[model samples]
Target: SEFVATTGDITVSVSTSFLPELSSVHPPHYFFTYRIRIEMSKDALPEKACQLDSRYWRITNAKGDVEEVQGPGVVGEFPIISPGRVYEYTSCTTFSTTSGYMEGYYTFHFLYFKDKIFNVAIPRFHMACPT
Candidate 1:
C-alpha cells in the first residue's frame, strides 16, 4: 500500500511490500519493506532549502508491542530536497504479529528560514499480507 502526507512544504510518500519469504506464520513474524520518497514543493525555499537531519519512527504491532526509534540521518545519508527533485530510500522492519503499522517524522535543519528546525510527517503505512 501507499501512504502520503504533507507537512509545511515537505511531502512524505511511501510504498510498502510484505515479504512472505522472510516471514513465518507459525511464530507470527511479518517482515515488510518500505520505500520512502521525500518531495519539496516550489514554495519550500528550494533555492536555500534545509537539510534532512534525523528521523523518528513509531512502530506498533497487533499485539500492542510498540517500538520507538530515533536516529540521526536515514540509512547513513542526509538528503537535501529541491523543487522537481526528490530523495528516495529503502528500509525494512519486522513485527512479531501478523499486522501492524509504521509512522514517523523527519527533522530538517534550515539555515535560511525563521525556524531553524522543521518536521515533516510520514503517514502511517500498514505492514501485512492479505489473506
Candidate 2:
C-alpha cells in the first residue's frame, strides 16, 4: 500500500497510512492499524537525517475526554540514511474507536560532524470503527 507523505525534507520523507481490519472488530471494541514508513532520499543531507526518537499518540473522544498513549523508540539508528541511500522502517499502532482521531510527534536525531535532535509531527488521522 502507498502511504501519504506528510513530512519531506532534505534528509528524508516520512509518510503514514492505515490498514483497517474490518473483520477484526469485537463489538464495543475495534482496532485500526497504521504503518509509518520513512523513506530516505539520495539527496538526503547528512546533517538533517531523520530518526524516530520518541512519540506521543493522543486520542480525543466526542465526550471531551482525552487519552494519551506513548510509542516505542525510534526503530533505527541516527542519520537514518546517507546520500544515495534509502531506508524504510515500519511501526504499527492499534487504537480502539470508531469516532476518534490521533495526533502525535516523533523526535529525530541527526549524526553529522556533531549530533542534533529534531522533531517530526504526525497529524491526526481517522479511526473508523467496524460495523
Candidate 3:
C-alpha cells in the first residue's frame, strides 16, 4: 500500500510489501521491502544539489517492541536530489514478529549552502501477514 507524508515543500511517499519468500515465518523472522519516492516542489527552493546525509528509522512490532535504526545515507549511497526532481530508492527491513510498522526521517545536506541541514519525514507504513 502507499502512504504519504509531507514536510514543508517536500513530500515523501512509500509503498511497502511483505516478502514471504524471503522470510521464515516458522522462525518468526519476517521481511518487508519498501520503495520511497521523495518529491520536491519546483518553488520549494532555488535549484541546487542536496545529499541525503543520514536516516533514522523506528520499527515497532506487534507486541509494541521498538527497534531504532540510524545510519548514514541510504543503501550505501548519498544521492543528490535537486529542486523539481524526484529521488527514489527501495530498501528492506526485517522484523522478528508477525506484524510491525515503520516510520523515519532523512537528514539532507544542502550542498549549495555549505552543508546546511534539513529533514524530511518518512510516512509510517505497516507490515503484516495475511490471515
Candidate 4:
C-alpha cells in the first residue's frame, strides 16, 4: 500500500526486504530499501517550478525516544512527472537494531516559486531487529 501526503498530486509507496547477498553480521540483519514513485499533473506546473526539496524522518516508540533526521533535497535527481507521466525515486536506510519504526516527509518546492517547503509524508514501517 502507499501513503498519502499534503501534496494531493504526490503519492509515495514503499516495499522492504532482506538482501542475503549483502549480509555481514551474525544475527543476519538484512538491508531494507524502497522504490518511491510520484505522479503529478503536468498542467499543474513545470519541472523547474516543481521540486523535491528537504526531507524529514523521525523514529518514535512507546518509550517516547524520538530520533529525527532532515536533509536537503532528495538523494538522487528530482524529475518532474508530466501529466500522465510518473516520476520515481528509490532510497534506503539500515537499522542496527531490528525493533524500531520510522516516519518522515519529503519537501517540495512549487514551480521554483515559493521559498516555502511542501512536505510529502512517507509511510510508517516496522523493522524487525536481529534475534
Query: Which one is best on lDDT?
Result: 1
Of 1 and 4, the candidate ahead on TM-score is 1
Overlapping backbone residue pairs in candidate 4 total 6
Report the candidate with higher lDDT, 1 versus 2. 1
Give TM-scores for every candidate, taking all chains together and pairing residue i with residue i: 0.92, 0.63, 0.88, 0.67
Which residue pairs show collisions in model 3? none
Query: Mind giving the per-residue lDDT tens digits that candidate 4 earns over 1-108?
Result: 244433566666665554546555666344566666666655554543456767788975434568898877667566544445666677766654444567888777
Runs with alpha carbons beyond 4 Å of true place in candidate 2: 1-5, 8-27, 71-96, 113-115
> Model 1: clashing residue pairs?
none
Better of 1 and 4 by lDDT: 1
lDDT of 1 by residue, 45-86 (tens): 555577899999999999888999999999999988766678
Question: Which lDDT tens digits does candidate 2 get at residues 5-53?
Answer: 3455623233434455442445634444555554555565665554556
lDDT of prediction 1: 0.87
Query: Which 10 successive residues of model 3 have the least lDDT summed?
Result: 43-52
Give one digit per residue, the lDDT tens place, for model 3 in 22-129: 888778889998999988878866645677889999989999899899999888888887778898999888888888999989999787897579988999989887
lDDT of 2 at 6: 42
Local error of candidate 3 at residue 73 (angstroms): 0.6
